[PDB]
RNA sequence: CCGCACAAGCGGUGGAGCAUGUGGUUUAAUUCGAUGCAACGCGAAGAACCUUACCUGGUCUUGACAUCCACGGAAGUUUUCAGAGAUGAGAAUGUGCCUUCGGGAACCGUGAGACAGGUGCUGCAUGGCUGUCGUCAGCUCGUGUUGUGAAAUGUUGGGUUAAGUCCCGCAACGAGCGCAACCCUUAUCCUUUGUUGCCAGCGGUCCGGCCGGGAACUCAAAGGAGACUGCCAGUGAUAAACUGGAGGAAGGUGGGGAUGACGUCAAGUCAUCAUGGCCCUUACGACCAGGGCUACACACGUGCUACAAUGGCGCAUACAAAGAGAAGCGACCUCGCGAGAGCAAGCGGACCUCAUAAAGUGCGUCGUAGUCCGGAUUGGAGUCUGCAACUCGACUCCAUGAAGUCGGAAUCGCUAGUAAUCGUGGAUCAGAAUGCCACGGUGAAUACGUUCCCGG
């Protein structure tokens, strides 16, 4: 992504000067209208160097977890993961999701069992209310684990939107050593992101830019 | 509080009776008396064959008894000799032409009667009970049981005050009638007193009614 | 009017006004009436003595009033004289026919006493 | 109960069945209309000579497993207790918990 | 010509046969007054015909078993309503509006153990 | 001439199996049957005290429901009465034959 | 009702006047579920009431209960922590029932050998605001 | 009452005792337990020691007692008051 | 914040009579146990004998009941005397069966000890079973995270539910036991099968579905369909969900049941049974007759019947459900005022029988009274069951006609087919229901509300 490509999308946007985090000073161009302005001169090379690492991980058969819980951007992140056949979390993050990998496996198994049961049959054996209830639980589990039913082993890389909002995820990742790739607004604490992208995390246009560029490079890394 | 007998409540839904003959009120009582005494005789005589259930079904002129044991070769002895002997015996008790057809249980660790009597046989041999019950539950679920709960009550370890000790593992949903929950009770007579064991073994929901 | 026995019957349906006498009740009364031929719904007033004397004649056949009172008193006195169980319970003033006496035997013991 | 009671019951029934025919014929002669009151008299005297434990009205249905003299159920021949064990264990055919 | 309904109220069950006629009623081979001496039954039996305002166009022959005088009245009402609907199939909405098509499911409640009557409890005592 | 068959049982499954086999073998010999007709089942109810001592209020209610089927063969061939005798009868099912 | 304030069910009109209030009246007068006795009593009383009041017997019943219907009554409240009486207005549907209840008990107290007559006499005195049915209404108004 | 078609009741051991007593003249009070037997006309003037359950109380039969059971003259409960 | 907890209602109890249980007192004995809720119409679903455990007396000591030993006798059947009876004393008959012929089995009797026997104690040694808070929505765990740690979190909060019910929120994520569902029953319909059940169209008739029939309907009993907040609108964080509406036989867990979490009360039960220990053993065991458990100055609890006219009585007459039946239910006719009796059909039962439902309705009478209310009590006379109704049965008839005229403080049940009221059946049982468990008929009033009372 080129600085002009970002700027038109508005990547330079940042949270009000009232709300910023101390470590973000190096990445901040300045202020206008009491608004923090992010410096694309740092943003572009860091994003490119992160894309290099993401291409490397995906080119060694990496499993990628796209992470974002914004109600506006949930579908964008889900489609972004689907466009590169990668796993995703688009709904509210569950506490200790990576730390309780054993607990999630049972939920995935239950989600797989419910979908398998509906295809196999025995819904007729169940009472009509019971069969409907099983379908509702399967739908709830799909809303809960649609993205990670095919996760298999813990992921090899994480992409995070608004790292401050998803702080539990990054704490887990660091506890596991799983690398964190994150779009970091001025209000976020950048310590948890090993490849940090400072940029707007709310605006739909810039978020879609991030996701599309990442997914293009991930498909490229897969293609070899 | 008290709990309904799990086997006695699932007779209509998932559990078959153990005496399936028919008779009108004229000779209902004495049928019951005869089959009670014959099954008690068989229990007393097969205290080592490890029998789990003795089902009894009567043709109009005959009595048919099916034994469920874990040691078929034992009860049939040599060339079916002793089984024919006890067939003559049940012929005496019932006063009726008798037929005995033994049946085996493939997973003896999955029979509430069997595991309960084994627990009691261990207790009367003066072994620490916690070991007994936890070994039983471990074996059961190692043999692929959906759940099992063991319960012992009495003067455990010769206690002056009787305590209740249970141990559950897996799923044991007593309230769900659809569940195949096999249950049986055994007693062990030690010098201190009589100790009672109860075993629930849940082997999976049976979708699709009785049949 | 006047009927055999000291008591005077009141003016109402004969079958009922006849019950006034100590020895006659509802079935014996209608028996007396049918024997005398007088209907039941007739009153004792508006009833000529020509049938009143017949009524007293037919009631004379049965034991009634004072003679019955003396006869029952002799029977209880005889019972007491035998010394039989019933005689004892009669002179004791207690239920005679085997009723429960642990409680609620008041009809023969009178009101509760301290 | 006490073995004495069960023995008493078995003796009572084993005498009632024995003297059944004689008792029946004698009661017939007694209650029979047109019977000569001397024959009726001899019959009512003879009746009380038989063992008093021959009258069937003198027996008591006891639990056929414990001898309990209460809570009896003619259909099964057991007290109100043992019927519950036999039922819950699946020994009384076609017997199950009712609900309506 | 013939239109049949079947109405049940409480423990009673009534077959109802409807033919074009002058308003003649017959119940168990008896006239409506021969059967129901009580006027309220005499009115609840004819309520639907008053609704559809066809009380001299239809002769109906009905027979009812079980229940009591009012139970049977309700059963025959529910029967003649079903018969009418099978005869017209447009009075359905009106009869439904009057609550004549409901087959009231109310039934007597069983006695319960330790309870003198269904939902009735023995008298409690303090001391 | 005809033969009435009453079948009593304690469970409808067994009685239905047996009556199906009866009507089948009878139809097989060509004897004309009157179908299986379900007569009202009987329900004996026993309300028995659950507690050994002092609990009149606490008790349980059991029932024995006996099911009753009636089949009828109007023109019984001589290949039939012997045939139905040969047919095996379940121990639970009770069969009564009446010409 | 602590949790769910359930709505009241509907009563069926009377088969002689289609009047919901008459049916409520007979339901109040009823004893031991003997509806037929109650309807006999009420129709007898209404017709004799008609004889004294001329035309419109159902209307005469309406104005009779009107002349004794209550407007204000004392109500108890424990909000103070001690018993506390307060004068409160009564909804029409409830004062209907109160008037009917007062009428029937007053009739039972009247005696004179027949319920039919007691009810009619009480209704006739109620129609003209008398018979002590109004006096009981007046005293609970005074207690405001 | 017992009946009329069956006549009064008496157990024959008491009957034999009473006939042997009357035919033999004045006798010692007859010691019997049969409270259930009824007083017959022949036993008038006799004296029967009838069991009250703890002792045989004497009862001197009079013609008035005829048509009654013996037990009616042997009370089985002692009571004086409170 | 819920709960008939209160309020709002309807009917009661508390007063009377009686039924029944208990305390007490009494007794030769009034057998034992149950004792705030959660003992007191409780064990006991049925004490005249029996039961029966108690009392009095009469009797037995390897025994009433079991095994083992020998020894002798088939077994068994029929009578006689004594005795209250256990028991003794006999007296006749039989003296059989199998067997490789010796014997055995079968039982019976006598002796020998091993032993049996205990409803004797301990439910504070216990098992088993049960009550209770409570059908309450709770009780927990795994892993994760937090804290130095005891621990916490989850399980709290916002809402919402019958509910730890559900959705959001939230370092928690899930799980298990409960909740709910699965089961029974009930409310609609469909299919299948039509006799002993059914009678619409049919003809026929003695007017009787009764007979030709008919398979429609009712019904019977198997299988199946149906309800899902599924639809609509409104409300609401667009959430959960709630309100209303549609259609529908049924609407918001449709109604009822079964189902009782972890535990609490050293709760109950050694007298169902089992059982550790203790104790008894010519007796604390065993048998018999009679008595007692039914007492009676009292006290308490639960019921029944009443005090009437919305009723009583007379006459006429209509509409059920659910059950039971072979030593059983027992029709019809005959007899009896009646309970019943005689005769005797049918029915192991959709067939025959119990068994004609009663409130109701129509007519008549009764006229507010201790009554044509009430039925206690008592006299007389009976029937039936049973060896036997004295203690101490039920019922019938005639006679008798207490108290009682709506019940103090206080207190109980109940939210709809409910309460209230009316009958019917069953278990136990020879006989003995006002109790219990079930069935239907008629069929309400009220609920503003959670401040108080009580329990969670
Ligand atoms: Mg229970
Ligand atoms: Mg009289
Ligand atoms: Mg014993
Ligand atoms: Mg008896
Ligand atoms: Mg039957
Ligand atoms: Mg209140
Ligand atoms: Mg009282
Ligand atoms: Mg006592
Ligand atoms: Mg004791
Ligand atoms: Mg009770
Ligand atoms: Mg305890
Ligand atoms: Mg105790
Ligand atoms: Mg909690
Ligand atoms: Mg909350
Ligand atoms: Mg939470
Ligand atoms: Mg549940
Ligand atoms: Mg609606
Ligand atoms: Mg205790
Ligand atoms: Mg005795
Ligand atoms: Mg007693
Ligand atoms: Mg009277
Ligand atoms: Mg009087
Ligand atoms: Mg008066
Ligand atoms: Mg009812
Ligand atoms: Zn941001």
XYZ file of N, CA and C in Angstrom, chain C residues 21-109:
267
model
N -99.293 -38.125 70.512
C -99.405 -39.128 71.565
C -98.079 -39.857 71.726
N -97.700 -40.180 72.958
C -96.384 -40.779 73.201
C -96.147 -42.114 72.534
N -97.203 -42.882 72.276
C -96.959 -44.229 71.725
C -97.076 -44.332 70.213
N -97.359 -43.233 69.508
C -97.605 -43.352 68.038
C -96.661 -42.446 67.236
N -96.069 -42.974 66.158
C -95.167 -42.191 65.286
C -95.725 -42.106 63.875
N -94.920 -41.711 62.882
C -95.440 -41.463 61.505
C -96.059 -42.706 60.842
N -95.461 -43.891 60.976
C -96.008 -45.067 60.239
C -97.227 -45.618 60.980
N -97.129 -45.788 62.295
C -98.266 -46.203 63.100
C -99.416 -45.216 62.977
N -99.113 -43.930 62.813
C -100.170 -42.936 62.680
C -100.950 -43.135 61.391
N -100.247 -43.243 60.266
C -100.954 -43.469 59.018
C -101.641 -44.823 59.016
N -101.105 -45.793 59.755
C -101.802 -47.065 59.907
C -103.137 -46.868 60.607
N -103.123 -46.161 61.736
C -104.356 -45.864 62.457
C -105.343 -45.157 61.543
N -104.861 -44.163 60.802
C -105.743 -43.393 59.934
C -106.375 -44.278 58.872
N -105.552 -45.047 58.159
C -106.077 -45.923 57.120
C -107.068 -46.918 57.694
N -106.792 -47.435 58.889
C -107.739 -48.343 59.519
C -109.056 -47.639 59.795
N -108.997 -46.383 60.226
C -110.214 -45.620 60.449
C -110.789 -45.042 59.167
N -110.071 -45.140 58.052
C -110.554 -44.647 56.785
C -110.388 -43.163 56.558
N -110.132 -42.383 57.606
C -109.932 -40.951 57.438
C -108.639 -40.700 56.681
N -108.678 -39.750 55.752
C -107.496 -39.392 54.990
C -106.494 -38.657 55.877
N -105.297 -38.452 55.336
C -104.202 -37.874 56.105
C -104.252 -36.353 56.126
N -104.427 -35.733 54.962
C -104.363 -34.281 54.881
C -105.519 -33.597 55.594
N -106.489 -34.354 56.105
C -107.546 -33.739 56.889
C -106.949 -33.202 58.180
N -107.572 -32.172 58.729
C -107.126 -31.626 59.999
C -107.928 -32.222 61.147
N -107.415 -32.026 62.359
C -108.103 -32.544 63.534
C -109.327 -31.700 63.840
N -109.191 -30.383 63.767
C -110.373 -29.561 63.620
C -111.096 -29.971 62.343
N -112.310 -29.456 62.175
C -113.196 -29.853 61.079
C -113.159 -31.365 60.872
N -113.493 -32.083 61.938
C -113.485 -33.540 61.904
C -114.493 -34.007 62.943
N -115.656 -34.463 62.482
C -116.752 -34.780 63.387
C -116.352 -35.863 64.375
N -116.861 -35.745 65.602
C -116.567 -36.732 66.631
C -116.949 -38.139 66.203
N -117.876 -38.265 65.255
C -118.259 -39.576 64.767
C -117.078 -40.410 64.323
N -116.043 -39.769 63.794
C -114.808 -40.475 63.513
C -113.747 -40.269 64.580
N -113.900 -39.271 65.448
C -112.945 -39.110 66.539
C -113.020 -40.298 67.482
N -114.235 -40.739 67.799
C -114.375 -41.915 68.643
C -113.792 -43.143 67.960
N -113.941 -43.245 66.641
C -113.323 -44.357 65.930
C -111.808 -44.289 66.027
N -111.251 -43.088 65.892
C -109.814 -42.916 66.049
C -109.360 -43.382 67.419
N -110.067 -42.959 68.465
C -109.663 -43.369 69.803
C -109.831 -44.872 69.990
N -110.843 -45.465 69.360
C -111.007 -46.911 69.436
C -109.820 -47.624 68.811
N -109.397 -47.169 67.636
C -108.310 -47.857 66.956
C -106.977 -47.599 67.634
N -106.812 -46.433 68.257
C -105.580 -46.190 68.987
C -105.582 -46.957 70.296
N -106.765 -47.374 70.756
C -106.850 -48.161 72.010
C -106.204 -49.533 71.794
N -106.194 -50.019 70.550
C -105.640 -51.370 70.261
C -104.145 -51.397 70.597
N -103.415 -50.333 70.244
C -101.950 -50.269 70.500
C -101.684 -49.748 71.914
N -100.500 -50.040 72.464
C -100.128 -49.486 73.801
C -99.650 -48.046 73.587
N -100.212 -47.080 74.322
C -99.875 -45.649 74.051
C -99.850 -44.829 75.343
N -99.192 -43.664 75.322
C -99.211 -42.718 76.476
C -98.665 -43.334 77.768
N -99.394 -43.203 78.881
C -98.879 -43.633 80.198
C -98.564 -45.111 80.289
N -99.402 -45.973 79.713
C -99.170 -47.431 79.882
C -97.817 -47.788 79.256
N -97.497 -47.200 78.097
C -96.183 -47.446 77.445
C -95.057 -46.924 78.344
N -95.248 -45.756 78.965
C -94.185 -45.154 79.814
C -93.890 -46.094 80.985
N -94.935 -46.684 81.572
C -94.745 -47.623 82.705
C -94.065 -48.891 82.188
N -94.457 -49.365 81.004
C -93.913 -50.645 80.477
C -92.401 -50.515 80.248
N -91.964 -49.411 79.634
C -90.508 -49.216 79.362
C -89.760 -49.074 80.694
N -90.355 -48.370 81.663
C -89.712 -48.188 82.989
C -89.561 -49.548 83.678
N -90.577 -50.408 83.574
C -90.475 -51.768 84.165
C -89.346 -52.529 83.466
N -89.240 -52.398 82.140
C -88.212 -53.165 81.388
C -86.804 -52.742 81.823
N -86.559 -51.434 81.946
C -85.225 -50.945 82.413
C -85.004 -51.364 83.871
N -86.050 -51.297 84.702
C -85.930 -51.689 86.131
C -85.575 -53.177 86.198
N -86.225 -53.998 85.370
C -85.929 -55.453 85.335
C -84.470 -55.628 84.918
N -84.052 -54.951 83.847
C -82.669 -55.017 83.390
C -81.703 -54.723 84.526
N -81.954 -53.642 85.262
C -81.109 -53.323 86.404
C -81.173 -54.411 87.463
N -82.327 -55.061 87.607
C -82.489 -56.055 88.660
C -81.686 -57.311 88.372
N -81.602 -57.714 87.103
C -80.769 -58.864 86.770
C -79.332 -58.662 87.210
N -78.880 -57.417 87.275
C -77.468 -57.169 87.413
C -76.695 -57.383 86.139
N -77.382 -57.533 85.013
C -76.711 -57.714 83.742
C -75.919 -56.467 83.376
N -74.994 -56.647 82.434
C -74.140 -55.557 81.980
C -74.956 -54.318 81.630
N -76.018 -54.499 80.848
C -76.877 -53.372 80.514
C -77.501 -52.773 81.760
N -77.873 -53.609 82.726
C -78.409 -53.077 83.966
C -77.419 -52.177 84.675
N -76.163 -52.614 84.753
C -75.132 -51.787 85.361
C -74.999 -50.462 84.631
N -74.822 -50.511 83.312
C -74.660 -49.268 82.570
C -75.898 -48.394 82.635
N -77.055 -48.967 82.945
C -78.249 -48.152 83.104
C -78.247 -47.439 84.443
N -77.910 -48.148 85.516
C -77.853 -47.477 86.804
C -76.616 -46.607 86.947
N -75.598 -46.825 86.122
C -74.445 -45.941 86.112
C -74.683 -44.686 85.293
N -75.621 -44.720 84.355
C -75.824 -43.598 83.463
C -74.725 -43.491 82.429
N -74.635 -44.474 81.547
C -73.577 -44.515 80.551
C -74.149 -45.120 79.283
N -73.459 -44.968 78.155
C -73.925 -45.610 76.923
C -74.076 -47.109 77.110
N -75.205 -47.630 76.651
C -75.597 -49.001 76.940
C -75.245 -49.908 75.775
N -75.335 -49.385 74.558
C -75.201 -50.207 73.364
C -73.780 -50.238 72.826
N -72.784 -50.129 73.696
C -71.407 -50.287 73.284
C -70.758 -49.066 72.682
N -71.384 -47.899 72.785
C -70.811 -46.701 72.200
C -69.479 -46.367 72.856
N -68.652 -45.636 72.118
C -67.419 -45.109 72.680
C -67.727 -44.224 73.874
N -67.029 -44.459 74.977
C -67.184 -43.637 76.162
C -65.932 -42.856 76.505
N -64.827 -43.090 75.801
C -63.631 -42.295 76.035
C -63.881 -40.829 75.742
N -64.711 -40.538 74.745
C -65.075 -39.176 74.394
C -66.537 -39.138 73.983
N -67.040 -37.915 73.840
C -68.334 -37.587 73.236
C -69.417 -38.621 73.531
N -69.529 -38.991 74.801
C -70.683 -39.747 75.274
C -71.632 -38.847 76.041
N -71.778 -37.606 75.578
C -72.418 -36.581 76.392
C -73.910 -36.824 76.545
N -74.558 -37.350 75.508
C -76.005 -37.520 75.530
C -76.493 -38.289 76.746
N -75.661 -39.145 77.330
C -76.039 -39.876 78.526
C -75.319 -39.411 79.777
N -74.194 -38.717 79.643
C -73.470 -38.213 80.797
C -73.808 -36.770 81.132
